[PDB]
Amino acid sequence: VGFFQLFRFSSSTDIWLMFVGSLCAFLHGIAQPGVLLIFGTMTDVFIDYDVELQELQICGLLNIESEMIKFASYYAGIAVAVLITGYIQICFWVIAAARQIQKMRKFYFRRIMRMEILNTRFSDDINKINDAIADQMALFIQRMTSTICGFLLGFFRGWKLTLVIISVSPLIGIGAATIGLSVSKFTDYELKAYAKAGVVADEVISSMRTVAAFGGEKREVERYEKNLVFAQRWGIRKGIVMGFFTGFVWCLIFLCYALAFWYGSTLVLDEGEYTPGTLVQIFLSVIVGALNLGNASPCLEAFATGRAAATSIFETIDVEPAPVRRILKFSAPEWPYMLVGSVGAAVNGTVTPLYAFLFSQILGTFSIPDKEEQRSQINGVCLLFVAMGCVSLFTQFLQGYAFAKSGELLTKRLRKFGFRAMLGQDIAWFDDLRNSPGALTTRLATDASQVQGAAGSQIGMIVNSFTNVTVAMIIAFSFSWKLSLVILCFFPFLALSGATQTRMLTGAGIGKERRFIEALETELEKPFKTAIQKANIYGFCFAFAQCIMFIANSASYRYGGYLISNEGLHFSYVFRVISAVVLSATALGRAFSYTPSYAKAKISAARFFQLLDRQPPISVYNTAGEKWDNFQGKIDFVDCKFTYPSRPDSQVLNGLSVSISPGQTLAFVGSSGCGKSTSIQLLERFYDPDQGKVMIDGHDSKKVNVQFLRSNIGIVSQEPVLFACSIMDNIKYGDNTKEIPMERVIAAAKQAQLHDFVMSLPEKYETNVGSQGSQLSRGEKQRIAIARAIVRDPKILLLDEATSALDTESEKTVQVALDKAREGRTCIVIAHRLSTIQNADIIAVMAQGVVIEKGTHEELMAQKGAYYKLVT
Numbered sequence: 001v002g003f004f005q006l007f008r009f010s011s012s013t014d015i016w017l018m019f020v021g022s023l024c025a026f027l028h029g030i031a032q033p034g035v036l037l038i039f040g041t042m043t044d045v046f047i048d049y050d051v052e053l054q055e056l057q058i059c060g061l062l063n064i065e066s067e068m069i070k071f072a073s074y075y076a077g078i079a080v081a082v083l084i085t086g087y088i089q090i091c092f093w094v095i096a097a098a099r100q101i102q103k104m105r106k107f108y109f110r111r112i113m114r115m116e117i118l119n120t121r122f123s124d125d126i127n128k129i130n131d132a133i134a135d136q137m138a139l140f141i142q143r144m145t146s147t148i149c150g151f152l153l154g155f156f157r158g159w160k161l162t163l164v165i166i167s168v169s170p171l172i173g174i175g176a177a178t179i180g181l182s183v184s185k186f187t188d189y190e191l192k193a194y195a196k197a198g199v200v201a202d203e204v205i206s207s208m209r210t211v212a213a214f215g216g217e218k219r220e221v222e223r224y225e226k227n228l229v230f231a232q233r234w235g236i237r238k239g240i241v242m243g244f245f246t247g248f249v250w251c252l253i254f255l256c257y258a259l260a261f262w263y264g265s266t267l268v269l270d271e272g273e274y275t276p277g278t279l280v281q282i283f284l285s286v287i288v289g290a291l292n293l294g295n296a297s298p299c300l301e302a303f304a305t306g307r308a309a310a311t312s313i314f315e316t317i318d319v320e321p322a323p324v325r326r327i328l329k330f331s332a333p334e335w336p337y338m339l340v341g342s343v344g345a346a347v348n349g350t351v352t353p354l355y356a357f358l359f360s361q362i363l364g365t366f367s368i369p370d371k372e373e374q375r376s377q378i379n380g381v382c383l384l385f386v387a388m389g390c391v392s393l394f395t396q397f398l399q400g401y402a403f404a405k406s407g408e409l410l411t412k413r414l415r416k417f418g419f420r421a422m423l424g425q426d427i428a429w430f431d432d433l434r435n436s437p438g439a440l441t442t443r444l445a446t447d448a449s450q451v452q453g454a455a456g457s458q459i460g461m462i463v464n465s466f467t468n469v470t471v472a473m474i475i476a477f478s479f480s481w482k483l484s485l486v487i488l489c490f491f492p493f494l495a496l497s498g499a500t501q502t503r504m505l506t507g508a509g510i511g512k513e514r515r516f517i518e519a520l521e522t523e524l525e526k527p528f529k530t531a532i533q534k535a536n537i538y539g540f541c542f543a544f545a546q547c548i549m550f551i552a553n554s555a556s557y558r559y560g561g562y563l564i565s566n567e568g569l570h571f572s573y574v575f576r577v578i579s580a581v582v583l584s585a586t587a588l589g590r591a592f593s594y595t596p597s598y599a600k601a602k603i604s605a606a607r608f609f610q611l612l613d614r615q616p617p618i619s620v621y622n623t624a625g626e627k628w629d630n631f632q633g634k635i636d637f638v639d640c641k642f643t644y645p646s647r648p649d650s651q652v653l654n655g656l657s658v659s660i661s662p663g664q665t666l667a668f669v670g671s672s673g674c675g676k677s678t679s680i681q682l683l684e685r686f687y688d689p690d691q692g693k694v695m696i697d698g699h700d701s702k703k704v705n706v707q708f709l710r711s712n713i714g715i716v717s718q719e720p721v722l723f724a725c726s727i728m729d730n731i732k733y734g735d736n737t738k739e740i741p742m743e744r745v746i747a748a749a750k751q752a753q754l755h756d757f758v759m760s761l762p763e764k765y766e767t768n769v770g771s772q773g774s775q776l777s778r779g780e781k782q783r784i785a786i787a788r789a790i791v792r793d794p795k796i797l798l799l800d801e802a803t804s805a806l807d808t809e810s811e812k813t814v815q816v817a818l819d820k821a822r823e824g825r826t827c828i829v830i831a832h833r834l835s836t837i838q839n840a841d842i843i844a845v846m847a848q849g850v851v852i853e854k855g856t857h858e859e860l861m862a863q864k865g866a867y868y869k870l871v872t
């Protein structure tokens with residue numbers, strides 16, 4: 001509706017509190033163009049003094065010392081003005097914002113409970129409306145004032161140089177807008193590209209028992225690594241486009257600098273209506289205005305989100321980040337692409353010190369007596385600007401492409417390795433409710449893409465800042481080291497102006513409806529006190545950050561004037577040293593603000609490594625065991641005790657002492673829960689026994705290879721989970737290993753009572769399963785599952801309550817297929833339904849799991865069994 005409707009207050013105190021802060025923000029915004037005007041005056045004074053100095057060695061009533069103490073005093077006064085004004089802005093704005101937001105929360109809470117008979121998102125929505133109103137609207141006003149006044153005095157002092165700079169501004173505007181649009185477009189494209197690999201991951205992890213039972217760990221990994229390339233390539237494309245566009249923006253900026261300096265030089269030398277100080281003032285003022293306009297996009301983003309969340313509440317009224325040293329170790333194969341990226345960082349790190357050097361050269365060449373040599377030097381510096389712009393284009397593009405490629409390769413490798421590790425875990429690891437299909441998929445998709453922040457981009461920005469600081473120090477200490485040390489004294493504070501920014505930013509009936517009107521109002525004193533203390537400390541930090549640059553400039557320029565009056569050094573050297581050191585300090589301060597991504601990436605890397613470095617009790621990838629000759633399935637149960645660590649409901653899981661010879665059926669019929677499916681897990685070694693032994697053969701379960709054991713058992717789950725690849729991929733999947741011919745599949749299909757149906761389809765055998773086909777009937781996917789179970793020719797069958805189809809017509813087909821699937825082989829079938837013949841085996845398991853009944857269809861009459869219990 002409007003961000004002016006947020007402040008519903010006619011209260012005088014809040015309005016005046018906001019008004020004073022807004023006035024001080026306006027004054028602070030005024031300060032920077034004014035200090036730039038003073039800077040232009042100094043530049044004019046320096047140039048005039050240098051000209052007279054050169055003339056005197058081939059007027060004089062200037063006394064550069066007096067002018068420089070006057071300018072330094074003006075700078076100190078502006079510094080204290082900035083300190084006071086910024087303190088007022090932050091303190092008053094955040095205090096008033098906290099007051100109004102707590103009043104709104106109080107009104108909301110008093111209004112919700114009195115009426116006829118997403119909450120913490122609300123807390124975060126009020127959080128964001130207070131965020132839109134506390135400091136975003138003060139900084140926005142200050143930056144708007146800064147840019148408007150910068151453009152205004154740029155026009156006022158000279159209306160042509162600012163005119164051409166404005167005329168060249170749009171191309172940069174179009175480039176920035178296109179970059180902003182691409183930020184979201186490529187995010188959407190990357191999500192669409194990764195959708196397929198994510199779908200594969202969810203399909204595999206969702207049904208992990210089936211994947212592990214058939215030993216299809218390698219096949220799913222193969223599918224995942226095959227599908228990951230389509231998202232890796234889109235990551236590469238986004239990276240290269242972004243790098244090229246940022247290089248284009250940088251090259252355009254440097255071309256603008258060259259054009260402005262050539263045009264200003266022509267105006268100053270030929271026409272003469274511009275003095276060089278006016279040129280410097282105009283250029284710096286327009287640059288400051290552009291920077292302030294660019295920096296306001298965040299603030300406008302906040303304003304938007306906040307109006308939005310009050311549009312949300314307007315009608316409710318009226319484990320350890322320790323390991324990082326191994327991230328490089330894990331990223332060893334991508335050593336060249338990072339190295340090349342480092343070359344991109346080490347080259348584009350020098351652009352700021354070189355820009356300071358070239359600006360100082362332009363300033364110092366304005367005192368050259370020769371007009372033609374002046375023009376030649378200016379032309380040379382403009383050509384250097386053009387060359388540096390082109391170099392920045394190429395280097396930014398190359399750095400972006402290389403680091404995006406390294407990050408995407410690392411993400412793909414991490415995703416594949418994490419998927420392999422997840423597939424290698426035991427079944428119990430998937431029931432913790434902290435490693436869930438959704439959470440595991442999130443870890444595969446998001447965390448791996450996040451580790452690249454600590455891996456590649458972090459190294460790049462570190463190298464960029466290190467090279468920036470090194471080159472700036474080399475420039476500063478090679479011309480005047482004394483002034484270099486003087487400004488280096490303020491260097492740590494200038495860096496901390498941005499380094500500590502994040503560290504401080506991130507830090508009805510029976511009820512009488514009248515008791516709670518008083519227990520809530522007094523509760524909000526402490527949040528108000530902490531808010532006002534935080535606002536005061538924020539104000540002090542922000543005011544110090546804003547005024548430290550002015551103080552440093554004042555002191556350094558006073559000392560530079562002293563040096564010029566005493567030591568025979570150019571003013572251009574003073575400008576060079578001071579500007580280079582200040583810019584390097586700003587860059588370094590921007591560098592240490594890396595925590596919001598670096599800490600998250602380190603947490604992500606730690607979680608992965610913890611997942612990868614886990615040794616499970618039952619390792620499918622382990623080759624430990626002893627059973628090899630003539631498998632027959634002489635399964636035996638001895639006093640097996642199970643606690644079921646997922647849920648301690650039936651920790652007394654004992655009484656199972658059955659043992660069947662090879663070729664014997666064994667039906668487990670008992671209660672509806674905790675007596676049906678546990679032995680399935682024990683036979684599959686999904687969980688190892690705790691206080692019992694499962695004696696599969698001459699050797700026990702705990703000491704037989706899991707791969708070999710699962711290879712000999714055919715599993716038919718309760719619900720038939722089938723992959724969406726193909727019928728062949730869903731029938732030959734049972735023997736996922738080699739030695740699978742197109743034969744032995746026709747026999748399995750015939751034995752599964754499916755060959756006629758699979759023959760009826762036009763796509764006879766290459767039919768695709770899923771939403772792209774017609775197989776939704778249970779009595780057909782169940783038959784494909786049974787076929788997949790039988791093609792491996794397993795000695796043991798593990799029916800797990802199949803034939804759960806409502807239509808009896810399909811039930812008869814699946815049950816006759818299962819009956820033809822046994823053919824005198826060991827099996828443990830769970831059948832709540834009475835379809836299975838009771839002559840298969842004896843009813844022995846009760847609710848507790850105790851095994852007592854053993855007689856062949858004659859002890860079930862004296863003792864309550866399956867049918868005898870139901871008939872009473």
Ligand SMILES: COc1ccc(Cl)cc1C(=O)NCCc1ccc(S(=O)(=O)NC(=O)NC2CCCCC2)cc1
Nearest residue numbers: 032035039075287288356359360549550553575576579
């Ligand atoms: C002070 O510029 C220079 C003078 C000479 C040279 Cl070779 C380079 C620069 C330079 O740095 N070019 C980078 C672009 C730039 C500069 C300043 C600002 S700024 O934010 O307006 N600076 C202040 O507010 N501090 C003032 C500056 C004047 C003295 C008193 C303190 C914003 C952007």
Ligand SMILES: CC(C)CCC[C@@H](C)[C@H]1CC[C@H]2[C@@H]3CC=C4C[C@@H](O)CC[C@]4(C)[C@H]3CC[C@]12C
Nearest residue numbers: 003004007008009015018019022023026141145
């Ligand atoms: C824009 C710069 C250059 C000039 C200074 C602007 C100041 C005076 C503006 C900026 C934001 C403004 C406030 C924005 C919204 C409201 C809510 C409305 O219900 C009453 C007026 C009030 C409280 C405004 C008072 C004036 C205000 C503080």
Ligand SMILES: CC(C)CCC[C@@H](C)[C@H]1CC[C@H]2[C@@H]3CC=C4C[C@@H](O)CC[C@]4(C)[C@H]3CC[C@]12C
Nearest residue numbers: 027030031033034035037038078080081084085
């Ligand atoms: C809040 C109290 C303590 C201080 C108020 C600070 C105000 C009045 C100061 C801060 C910066 C100052 C400006 C800085 C530089 C210039 C350029 C000069 O050629 C004319 C004056 C002018 C435009 C100043 C006007 C007054 C000014 C806006």
Ligand SMILES: CC(C)CCC[C@@H](C)[C@H]1CC[C@H]2[C@@H]3CC=C4C[C@@H](O)CC[C@]4(C)[C@H]3CC[C@]12C
Nearest residue numbers: 160163164165166167168169171259262263266
């Ligand atoms: C319009 C956008 C894309 C920015 C580009 C504008 C350029 C091409 C314009 C802006 C100012 C112009 C200059 C203004 C005045 C002079 C003086 C003399 O030497 C003749 C040409 C020359 C040097 C012009 C050449 C073209 C020029 C440099």
Ligand SMILES: CC(C)CCC[C@@H](C)[C@H]1CC[C@H]2[C@@H]3CC=C4C[C@@H](O)CC[C@]4(C)[C@H]3CC[C@]12C
Nearest residue numbers: 168252255256258259262378379380382383386
């Ligand atoms: C395309 C938009 C962004 C404007 C960029 C134009 C820039 C790169 C162009 C416009 C005018 C050009 C100048 C025109 C003429 C000369 C004189 C020659 O002896 C040396 C190069 C020099 C000094 C050129 C340097 C590059 C220059 C400043």
Ligand SMILES: CC(C)CCC[C@@H](C)[C@H]1CC[C@H]2[C@@H]3CC=C4C[C@@H](O)CC[C@]4(C)[C@H]3CC[C@]12C
Nearest residue numbers: 328329330331332335338339342343346459463
């Ligand atoms: C050109 C200069 C400035 C920087 C060069 C790049 C440096 C900082 C970085 C970029 C990527 C880094 C490599 C990334 C990963 C590994 C694998 C592991 O065994 C640790 C060392 C090693 C081999 C790193 C060595 C240092 C390295 C090459």
Ligand SMILES: CC(C)CCC[C@@H](C)[C@H]1CC[C@H]2[C@@H]3CC=C4C[C@@H](O)CC[C@]4(C)[C@H]3CC[C@]12C
Nearest residue numbers: 251252255258379380382383386387389390393
């Ligand atoms: C984005 C870039 C490529 C835009 C093109 C602008 C640059 C590359 C072009 C425009 C005009 C060119 C200048 C035109 C003429 C001369 C005079 C010659 O004796 C030296 C080279 C020099 C000074 C050229 C250097 C390159 C130049 C500045």
Ligand SMILES: CC(C)CCC[C@@H](C)[C@H]1CC[C@H]2[C@@H]3CC=C4C[C@@H](O)CC[C@]4(C)[C@H]3CC[C@]12C
Nearest residue numbers: 469470473474477480481482484485488491492
């Ligand atoms: C890393 C950054 C932030 C700070 C580095 C400060 C270093 C480079 C400074 C601190 C003290 C300095 C020295 C102080 C005095 C002299 C004596 C004379 O011969 C000039 C150079 C020399 C020898 C300086 C060289 C640079 C120096 C060693």
Ligand SMILES: CC(C)CCC[C@@H](C)[C@H]1CC[C@H]2[C@@H]3CC=C4C[C@@H](O)CC[C@]4(C)[C@H]3CC[C@]12C
Nearest residue numbers: 481482483484485486487488489490491492559
């Ligand atoms: C590395 C940073 C923090 C600087 C640390 C040293 C600072 C605090 C001190 C130690 C030695 C000092 C210098 C010693 C001698 C002189 C000569 C005299 O004309 C005063 C300025 C000057 C040039 C001093 C400037 C300040 C100085 C550089």
